[PDB]
Design an enzyme around this catalytic site. Structure first.
Site, PDB file in Angstrom:
ATOM      1  N   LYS A  28       0.709  -1.043   0.307  1.00 25.06           N
ATOM      2  CA  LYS A  28      -0.047   0.022  -0.184  1.00 25.06           C
ATOM      3  C   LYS A  28       0.863   1.216   0.045  1.00 25.06           C
ATOM      4  O   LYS A  28       1.659   1.260   0.771  1.00 25.06           O
ATOM      5  CB  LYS A  28      -1.006   0.048   1.196  1.00 25.06           C
ATOM      6  CG  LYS A  28      -1.543   1.377   1.496  1.00 25.06           C
ATOM      7  CD  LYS A  28      -2.511   1.280   2.686  1.00 25.06           C
ATOM      8  CE  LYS A  28      -3.231   2.612   2.820  1.00 25.06           C
ATOM      9  NZ  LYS A  28      -4.424   2.462   4.109  1.00 25.06           N
ATOM     10  N   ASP A  87      -2.587  10.329   3.887  1.00 24.38           N
ATOM     11  CA  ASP A  87      -4.034   9.894   4.083  1.00 24.38           C
ATOM     12  C   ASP A  87      -4.828  10.784   5.100  1.00 24.38           C
ATOM     13  O   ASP A  87      -4.717  10.604   6.004  1.00 24.38           O
ATOM     14  CB  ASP A  87      -4.028   8.515   4.517  1.00 24.38           C
ATOM     15  CG  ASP A  87      -5.648   8.038   4.742  1.00 24.38           C
ATOM     16  OD1 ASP A  87      -6.364   8.667   3.833  1.00 24.38           O
ATOM     17  OD2 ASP A  87      -5.928   6.636   4.996  1.00 24.38           O
ATOM     18  N   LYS A  98     -10.327  12.662   8.283  1.00 29.45           N
ATOM     19  CA  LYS A  98      -9.913  12.212   9.919  1.00 29.45           C
ATOM     20  C   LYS A  98      -9.927  13.293  10.644  1.00 29.45           C
ATOM     21  O   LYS A  98      -8.863  14.081  10.961  1.00 29.45           O
ATOM     22  CB  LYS A  98      -8.316  11.585   9.668  1.00 29.45           C
ATOM     23  CG  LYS A  98      -8.305  10.454   8.885  1.00 29.45           C
ATOM     24  CD  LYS A  98      -6.653  10.067   8.653  1.00 29.45           C
ATOM     25  CE  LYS A  98      -6.496   8.635   7.921  1.00 29.45           C
ATOM     26  NZ  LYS A  98      -7.173   7.611   8.377  1.00 29.45           N
ATOM     27  N   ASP A 139      -1.806  13.034  11.900  1.00 27.04           N
ATOM     28  CA  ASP A 139      -0.655  13.581  11.992  1.00 27.04           C
ATOM     29  C   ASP A 139       0.469  12.512  11.697  1.00 27.04           C
ATOM     30  O   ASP A 139       1.671  12.885  11.648  1.00 27.04           O
ATOM     31  CB  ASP A 139      -0.123  14.539  13.134  1.00 27.04           C
ATOM     32  CG  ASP A 139      -0.300  13.697  14.451  1.00 27.04           C
ATOM     33  OD1 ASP A 139      -1.396  13.207  14.725  1.00 27.04           O
ATOM     34  OD2 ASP A 139       0.647  13.800  15.204  1.00 27.04           O
ATOM     35  N   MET A 145      -0.177  10.236   9.423  1.00 25.03           N
ATOM     36  CA  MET A 145      -0.610   9.634   8.062  1.00 25.03           C
ATOM     37  C   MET A 145       0.373   9.664   7.152  1.00 25.03           C
ATOM     38  O   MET A 145       0.184   9.172   6.082  1.00 25.03           O
ATOM     39  CB  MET A 145      -1.895  10.048   7.812  1.00 25.03           C
ATOM     40  CG  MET A 145      -3.173   9.424   8.713  1.00 25.03           C
ATOM     41  SD  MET A 145      -3.188   7.586   8.918  1.00 25.03           S
ATOM     42  CE  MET A 145      -3.589   7.557  10.451  1.00 25.03           C
ATOM     43  N   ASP A 165       1.326   6.060   5.729  1.00 22.46           N
ATOM     44  CA  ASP A 165       0.375   5.293   5.140  1.00 22.46           C
ATOM     45  C   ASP A 165       1.163   4.816   3.679  1.00 22.46           C
ATOM     46  O   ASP A 165       0.327   4.249   2.951  1.00 22.46           O
ATOM     47  CB  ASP A 165      -0.967   5.985   4.659  1.00 22.46           C
ATOM     48  CG  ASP A 165      -1.920   4.996   4.769  1.00 22.46           C
ATOM     49  OD1 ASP A 165      -2.071   4.020   5.722  1.00 22.46           O
ATOM     50  OD2 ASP A 165      -3.149   5.318   4.221  1.00 22.46           O
ATOM     51  N   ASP A 223     -12.043   6.893   3.474  1.00 22.14           N
ATOM     52  CA  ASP A 223     -11.111   7.020   4.091  1.00 22.14           C
ATOM     53  C   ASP A 223     -10.641   5.496   4.027  1.00 22.14           C
ATOM     54  O   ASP A 223      -9.831   4.929   4.778  1.00 22.14           O
ATOM     55  CB  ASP A 223     -11.245   7.486   5.604  1.00 22.14           C
ATOM     56  CG  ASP A 223     -10.045   7.528   6.347  1.00 22.14           C
ATOM     57  OD1 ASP A 223      -8.904   7.792   5.839  1.00 22.14           O
ATOM     58  OD2 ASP A 223     -10.032   7.724   7.489  1.00 22.14           O
ATOM     59  N   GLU A 227      -9.361   4.073   1.759  1.00 20.14           N
ATOM     60  CA  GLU A 227      -9.037   4.172   0.259  1.00 20.14           C
ATOM     61  C   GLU A 227      -7.840   3.266   0.026  1.00 20.14           C
ATOM     62  O   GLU A 227      -7.817   2.899  -1.163  1.00 20.14           O
ATOM     63  CB  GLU A 227      -8.243   5.852   0.049  1.00 20.14           C
ATOM     64  CG  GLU A 227      -6.768   5.823   0.619  1.00 20.14           C
ATOM     65  CD  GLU A 227      -6.734   5.471   2.406  1.00 20.14           C
ATOM     66  OE1 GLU A 227      -7.734   5.765   2.826  1.00 20.14           O
ATOM     67  OE2 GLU A 227      -5.713   5.037   2.441  1.00 20.14           O
ATOM     68  N   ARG A 271      -7.769   0.016   0.374  1.00 22.81           N
ATOM     69  CA  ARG A 271      -8.227  -1.308  -0.340  1.00 22.81           C
ATOM     70  C   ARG A 271      -8.509  -1.017  -1.883  1.00 22.81           C
ATOM     71  O   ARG A 271      -8.610  -1.968  -2.540  1.00 22.81           O
ATOM     72  CB  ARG A 271      -9.263  -1.646   0.340  1.00 22.81           C
ATOM     73  CG  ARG A 271     -10.726  -1.133   0.385  1.00 22.81           C
ATOM     74  CD  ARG A 271     -11.840  -1.556   1.369  1.00 22.81           C
ATOM     75  NE  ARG A 271     -11.324  -1.230   2.645  1.00 22.81           N
ATOM     76  CZ  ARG A 271     -11.746  -1.260   3.918  1.00 22.81           C
ATOM     77  NH1 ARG A 271     -13.428  -1.884   3.779  1.00 22.81           N
ATOM     78  NH2 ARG A 271     -11.589  -0.866   5.188  1.00 22.81           N
TER      79      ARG A 271
HETATM   80  N1  LIG Z   1      -4.472   4.555   6.900  1.00 27.49           N
HETATM   81  C1  LIG Z   1      -5.456   3.562   7.241  1.00 27.49           C
HETATM   82  C2  LIG Z   1      -5.161   3.729   8.719  1.00 27.49           C
HETATM   83  C3  LIG Z   1      -3.825   3.098   9.341  1.00 27.49           C
HETATM   84  C4  LIG Z   1      -3.557   3.121  10.605  1.00 27.49           C
HETATM   85  C5  LIG Z   1      -4.484   3.803  11.601  1.00 27.49           C
HETATM   86  N2  LIG Z   1      -3.975   4.012  12.940  1.00 27.49           N
HETATM   87  C6  LIG Z   1      -3.130   3.320  13.377  1.00 27.49           C
HETATM   88  C7  LIG Z   1      -2.929   3.765  14.677  1.00 27.49           C
HETATM   89  C8  LIG Z   1      -4.092   4.434  14.919  1.00 27.49           C
HETATM   90  N3  LIG Z   1      -4.884   4.649  13.763  1.00 27.49           N
HETATM   91  C9  LIG Z   1      -5.606   4.467  11.119  1.00 27.49           C
HETATM   92  C10 LIG Z   1      -5.833   4.328   9.575  1.00 27.49           C
HETATM   93  P1  LIG Z   1      -6.926   3.780   6.777  1.00 27.49           P
HETATM   94  O1  LIG Z   1      -7.570   5.388   7.198  1.00 27.49           O
HETATM   95  O2  LIG Z   1      -8.003   2.715   7.587  1.00 27.49           O
HETATM   96  O3  LIG Z   1      -6.987   3.785   5.347  1.00 27.49           O
HETATM   97 ZN   LIG Z   2      -7.781   6.016   5.178  1.00 28.27          ZN
HETATM   98 ZN   LIG Z   3      -4.838   4.400   4.434  1.00 30.77          ZN
END
Ligand SMILES: N[C@@H](c1ccc(-n2cccn2)cc1)P(=O)(O)O
Ligand SMILES: [Zn+2]
Ligand SMILES: [Zn+2]
Ligand SMILES: N[C@@H](c1ccc(-n2cccn2)cc1)P(=O)(O)O
Ligand SMILES: N[C@@H](c1ccc(-n2cccn2)cc1)P(=O)(O)O
Ligand SMILES: [Zn+2]
Ligand SMILES: [Zn+2]
Ligand SMILES: [Zn+2]
Ligand SMILES: [Zn+2]
Lengths: 511, 519, 518, 48
Positions: B290, B295, B302, B310, B312, B315, B375, B377, B379
């Site tokens: 990925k 993100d 978010k 912060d 992100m 990702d 969010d 995104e 997948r």
């Molecule tokens: N980027 C993914 C993600 C990854 C990790 C976390 N996260 C990791 C620790 C706490 N939150 C949240 C979203 P998504 O927003 O589910 O796509």
């Molecule tokens: Zn996301």
């Molecule tokens: Zn993500």
């Protein structure tokens, strides 16, 4: 054992139905080779189409009635499809001018039904039974299932068909089954009926609201159950619990008008004891959260009568074991029952309490109460000197985010035991998944003042943390912990599953 | 390479990468303990335990080739100290040649087989002795038992944790930063352990390289700059490379992946690196990571408490691990395999041009998808990356992704989850987890939840309406995009970032490399 | 210069009213010992009764009219009391057989009125001016006030009386009429006379600032606000320059430029200068935070209580600085050189915006890890402070709506001042006293400095652990002043008058008094 | 120990110490390998 009341209208017992109309159903299993007779009631074909689409329904079995056999011809049946759970049924006259209902349930395109799939099949079937006044149902298997899955079909049918009307203010009398190699499935029938009731009994306790099902009435119900099954029983009261120094368990109950009651039922096999087992169920009859009140969006305080689901599964298991009478095993059925309430008398966030093994515990959150009650139960269970301790509990909402609503999680200190549980999941068709106890997170339970913390402040893997906490209260005995917080309540059907009764009974039986 | 677009001239146009690290200047010499230990310049650390005796006393068992030091390290003198896991002590004395020497130990507890977690505690304690002490040399004496993999793991972790990333420091560089030039290791059966040394150095750099890409902020590390770094890496390693741009992605009809990047100022770039063995190819593997360089969540921004917007920049951790694996594979050159290293890189932003909640988009395999949350995104990008992977005609597809925050609630911060459609492949991953010492746990793809992805209008829903087990639902969604190939999915959302140390782990590099190598 | 538009209906300038009705008012001060003439309009007596709570109204001034004097006898007045803020209207005929209106405003028991008390008095008086079409108001001071408080009375009267109808179209007040004359009777009038035009200048500086603040973010954007500032400079003969993006890039203001990246309006850095004609003894830089709209950026203001609809006010600091430029440029102090500075930009959400986590480089070469895009003000101030210090001044004072935390520390009445120099801080407090804009000294707590340590960059923009954000923000700013006396005035709590639904123009008078007194 | 002027500068011990072994440990050349950053510590066991 008198239940205290605030007003004269408060109930003093849990209503329980023992003699259910499921118990009146005569069951007959026939081989499909000799053709099916269609003389009465409703007859349903379980039909798939491998490859298919959703392909057409095509009936393969021979039917000993001219008019029905005409109805079931390929040209008529291809008008319908085998999409999973899809059904059709029609009323018509047979060869003797009698009213007969005939139809099918689609079992899709896969040849091996999962527990989930089979459940969809039964639900469609039950919908027809609830919608039809029938003396008799006949089910003919045009799919292959093994003995366990056949029994699962029967249990699920009985359980889903049965309707709990205890709090409100017509069933078939015969079931026929046509299946290939009939004689190999016959032993499954009465076992299914026992498994159904253990499960339905668990359900009745869980569904019973907290005003009806409180620590006193639940222990009274457990005594009545043991008496009917000839199990030894012992209910420990506050005075004995104080003598045993169960401070973690007693602290949870401080704020309740219902005195704590510890349930101990014992089954002994006739034979030479080869395995001793303690089954420990979480028995919080209502979990308000305590001073850490369930007030946050999604905390589902209205569901919290279900927080004695572990205790119910253990009690339902007691029914099955007491009835089927397995040999060479001694089983203890334990539950530290209490109610987690808000009061001048309640334990507080921050309180340091002392478990029965001497360990001091700093309470970080009064809504992590289950693990406190389980700690003391586990100490008690280990003193019994058994070979296996298995606990089952609606312990952590985090299970909804890990395994969800279908699979329970099992954690343990012993791989052989864990594997036995996984096997019992396979044969019971109540699915369980092995999750790890990660020791790297143990440091997060190091209290600044007490011997140990109840909760972690930093770690969001709460199901694992709770397991690490529990593990501190078993010293030298193989132990496993089944977290059923996600699976216990059927959210869509608005009722309990009675999850775990069949799993634990299979565990006991398979040993 | 492509030109990185800038809003202002001070916007960075590349990711700073450190290839020649101080760890690479370190000369490693391994000796057999049976020859005795020479104790000279630098710092000599004994790794000591006491099996069964919790907080037991320190005893130095190894022969020491110096009379003064042997006397100093004799049982009576050492009994005042204990072996509590992580504890350490410094010693100072003069040796037989009248030169002052520094000696010490790190306690390895009372359990004989150290877990990967225990070993990290030992290493961190050791690193604490290396920091704030200008040393030319460290010598480590193993008086504990470790298998070959655990020995390599010690070295990797030492190298990783010792290293300090100062790429973004300017006025605040550490004035006293100074690394050893020599590392001595004494261990029984030393000749059997020697082969692990350069393997450890390669594994360290793959992991540290991934770490550098992840720690690099989203202004430095965007889809153009990240794909440019992959090109540079490929050129240095002599891997084949192809970076697919928007026009090529449009022609391939990668609508799900393209939709995610619509709102970004940075054009989508799909990374495709290839390693091919010179021998006859026996196995073909695609590794998919990925690659979301930031993100924000998109219109499903978010903004909720705990959403950690912060963090992100992390990702693209999955992409980073795949690239780190490319480094290791291209360096170690395994035989009889062809590996594809794949990442659908893009940035999930809020814009007039962004895709919207509710939008229906078409993936490259023709499946229409209803977007329930912008969010989710990852997948979507992985959907098209998985279709692309399967068309390569490989034996295995493995993806690795920071896919679901729910992982923190299931396995937490130490264990990653693996899901898949093929038991053999899953077990090979679990086996690689053992030999790499990067822990992974097998989680189920629960088919009962599949119906919750049924869309009223599109062929499929991107998210579940009713099921909160999002790591499982996401896996169910991904499975729809692999038709007939053994496939596994590694969710590292929980383990990628080291919250305590405030840095990435570069998790998955060693795992994936061991997977490639063992095969 | 040219303001970009999305559609042709988008405003391309801030409407500004310079010639206000207040400026048309002829003011006359008379000594009260000559007696009071009551001939027309409304004549209001300011009366107290020291030491007697809700004591009786007693009018002690000599009134040069027999009929009016009789009316205001103690016997007739005793039914009324002096409760602070109470007022009464009287109607009578004077000696000329003319209809005449008289009244009073109670000024309470304490013979020393506070800033807050005096504003109560002025507000009561304005209630008497509104909804009554009058050509003239006369005020008779029967209370003791020093010169700064007399000036404060006039400033506050002017500011509160003035109604801003720039954005009214179909809903203008049809009954809006302003007095054309103001008479003032006071003891020792000669010493108070010089305060009058000072009050007018101070009023307009404050009103001007409030016009800029109240103007919504579509009208008042970084281009139109910098355009306004040039117009002001031209009118006052101040030297000026506006630094555009290319110049900002050349100066490497990476913190300031990143905040504006997401905006359709280019960054504009305002630099006006006043220089005394004499010898220059003090050089001062005044820095105002100039965020024309603060959406929060990707850290969008979406939480309850974030008040995104108020964020047009986030250039209140720049506004105060420009209002001060008006006063200083008008009053022309000697011996001084003043630089009026603002790094103006807009904080928006875009494909082009800076992100949480971005590492950016300030003009002094310090790398900064952005932990929250909604802490944008201190990034823009960082570069403006570096710019300020390069000018080689004696003092740098910044003023900013920096932290909502101010609401929880000092609230809506007092601004906080932080600084690295006790002497400078004391001068600000002294200016607070003479401007009657209240300010309280808050500490820069060095123990929190470590919470700004970044793992990757030289420094963190925000704290990980500390909730005292007004202190943390000050610690951050302090890293951008190397060796110059600097003070920081956080007006986030006091800038907007929530009850009256309008800006105060807070800081103009404080800053002007600072410059004047030094 | 501190180091005025020199941020994170080297440790230098000034006090005279009445032990030859410890005096040698504390010589400038040994101590300069450590720095005075607030809170940083090192300690060593030795024979006097
Ligand atoms: N980027 C993914 C993600 C990854 C990790 C976390 N996260 C990791 C620790 C706490 N939150 C949240 C979203 P998504 O927003 O589910 O796509
Ligand atoms: Zn996301
Ligand atoms: Zn993500
Ligand atoms: N009773 C436990 C529990 C069980 C289930 C849920 N829960 C199930 C679904 C949603 N929340 C929450 C808490 P506890 O409050 O963690 O003790
Ligand atoms: N503009 C700053 C600010 C100022 C004031 C308030 N605020 C004042 C009252 C309520 N909230 C909020 C943010 P910032 O978002 O901290 O940059
Ligand atoms: Zn609870
Ligand atoms: Zn509970
Ligand atoms: Zn802000
Ligand atoms: Zn702001």
């Amino acid at each position: 054992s008198e239940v205290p009341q605030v007003v004269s209208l408060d109930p003093t017992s849990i209503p329980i139905e023992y003699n259910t109309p499921i118990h009146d159903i005569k069951v007959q299993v026939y081989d499909i080779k000799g053709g099916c007779n269609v003389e009465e009631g409703l007859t349903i074909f379980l039909v798939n189409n491998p490859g298919k689409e959703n392909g057409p329904v095509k009936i393969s079995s021979k039917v000993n009635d001219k008019q029905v056999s005409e109805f079931l011809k390929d040209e008529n049946m291809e008008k319908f499809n085998v999409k999973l759970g899809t059904s059709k049924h029609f009323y018509m006259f047979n060869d003797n001018k009698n009213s007969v209902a005939v139809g099918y349930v689609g079992c899709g395109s896969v040849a091996d039904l999962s527990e989930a799939d089979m459940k969809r099949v039964v639900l469609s079937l039950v919908t027809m039974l609830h919608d039809n006044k029938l003396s008799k149902l006949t089910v003919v298997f045009e799919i292959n299932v093994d003995k366990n899955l056949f029994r699962f079909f029967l249990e699920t049918l009985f359980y889903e068909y049965m309707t709990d009307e205890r709090f409100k203010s017509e069933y078939i009398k015969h079931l026929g089954v046509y299946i290939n190699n009939a004689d190999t499935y016959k032993e499954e029938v009465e076992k299914a009926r026992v498994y159904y009731f253990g499960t339905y009994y668990a359900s009745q306790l869980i569904a019973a609201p907290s005003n009806y099902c409180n620590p006193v009435s639940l222990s009274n119900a457990a005594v009545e159950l043991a008496q009917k099954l000839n199990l030894e029983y012992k209910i420990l009261g506050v005075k004995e619990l104080e003598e045993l120094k169960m401070g973690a368990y007693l602290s949870v109950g401080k704020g309740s008008m219902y005195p704590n009651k510890f349930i101990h039922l014992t089954y002994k096999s006739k034979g030479d004891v080869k395995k001793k087992i303690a089954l420990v169920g979480k028995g919080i009859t209502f979990d308000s959260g305590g001073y850490n009140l369930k007030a946050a969006p999604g905390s589902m305080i209205d569901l919290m009568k279900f927080d004695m689901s572990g205790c119910a599964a253990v009690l339902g298991c007691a029914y099955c074991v007491g009835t089927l009478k397995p040999e060479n095993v001694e089983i203890h059925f334990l539950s530290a029952v209490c109610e987690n309430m808000v009061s001048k008398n309640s334990y507080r966030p921050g309180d340091i309490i002392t478990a029965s093994n001497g360990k001091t515990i700093e309470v970080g959150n009064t809504d992590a109460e289950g693990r406190l009650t389980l700690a003391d139960a586990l100490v008690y269970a280990e003193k019994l000197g058994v070979d296996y301790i298995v606990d089952i509990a609606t312990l952590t909402g985090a299970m909804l985010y890990s395994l969800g609503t279908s699979y329970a999680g099992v954690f343990g200190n012993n791989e052989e035991l864990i594997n036995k549980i996984l096997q019992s999941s396979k044969t019971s068709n109540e699915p369980v998944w092995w999750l790890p106890i990660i020791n790297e997170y143990r440091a997060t339970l190091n209290s600044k003042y007490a011997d140990i913390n109840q909760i972690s402040s930093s770690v969001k893997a709460s199901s694992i943390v709770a397991s690490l906490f529990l593990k501190e209260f078993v010293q030298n005995t193989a132990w496993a912990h089944i977290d059923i917080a996600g699976v216990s309540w059927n959210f869509k059907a608005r009722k309990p599953k009675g999850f775990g009764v069949r799993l634990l009974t299979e565990f006991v039986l398979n040993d």
